[PDB]
Amino acid sequence: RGVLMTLLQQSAMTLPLWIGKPGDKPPPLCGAIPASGDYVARPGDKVAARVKAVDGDEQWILAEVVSYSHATNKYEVDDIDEEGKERHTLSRRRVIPLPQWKANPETDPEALFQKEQLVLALYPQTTCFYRALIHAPPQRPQDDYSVLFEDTSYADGYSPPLNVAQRYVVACKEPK
């Protein structure tokens, strides 16, 4: 478990900044810029994957694409925790590609999620994504988002600000 978290944090750390050039706009999958229309994630790419448990419960998890089949238009993905039976066959709408670059706040603030935006964010010390509001976008290249997770254990329904890296904040594809 300790080693898993080390790899996950390193994966957040090593996500490269989109450098680009003066005069240019950020590409799809830089920060908050959505995937292109009809995009298919590639084997080895990190994704949020919506896994339906046997009892029907739905959870977005961190996973890695294994394959995509044109035959069925489904992905196979592997749960990042690599534990037990890690593989899941999933529809495309159950897979959100994670960003492939950090948006640099210093050059491309337009590619960051903004305050009060609803997002799916990886909860600290977990491999799962949950609904959150952006509390602050990063202001330095290395900095996390600050987010407020929905959390029923608080009377007002929200956590205090928690830090989540750019690799692990995506568009909210989940109803309450």
């Binding site: 478990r1 898993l4 896994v51 959870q59 998890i61 961190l62 749960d79 990042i80 925790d81 909860y123 010390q125 977990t126 491999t127 799962c128 949950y130």
Partner: peptide
């Protein structure tokens, strides 16, 4: 997966 590790949950909250």
């Amino acid at each position: 997966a590790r949950t909250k």
